[PDB]
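Q: What would this chain look like folded?
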Amino acid sequence: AWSVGRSNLNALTGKTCGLANDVLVEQNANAGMLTPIGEPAGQALGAVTSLGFGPNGIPSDVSADPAAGINGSRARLPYGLNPATTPVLGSWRSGTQQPAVLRSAWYRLPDRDQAGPLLVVSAAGRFDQGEVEVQWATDEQAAANEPGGSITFGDVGAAPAWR
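A: My prediction, written as structure tokens:
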């Protein structure tokens, strides 16, 4: 990974662009979006559970990135994510606060041959590290609904805004 040293020694080599070489951008945000095993073109998000539901249950005024989508979201979307092409759910309750637990459908994970060496989910809220999880499971254990471990998503950015 990039350092002043790694940069300045790799400069004598030829590449004198510093960090420009190390920061990997995604021009289109909807671009490398994961399609599910099942055919629901959208709404594959709310599948197993959707307690404390919110297809518009996020305070759009509080949420920021710097009319209806698929699930009927009057709430704006970050990094140019097309709401007509991407579904969205929430946990923020205006009235009484209740224990919300969401579980998705199985998503089609391709064969290792991509420019982007990581998997990402554009999220918002004043949640902690332990909340959001990706449960990696074998296709045979996916039908039996028994996950073979779980990796926790690491957040970078400003709470409760979009990151």
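The radius of gyration is 19 Å.
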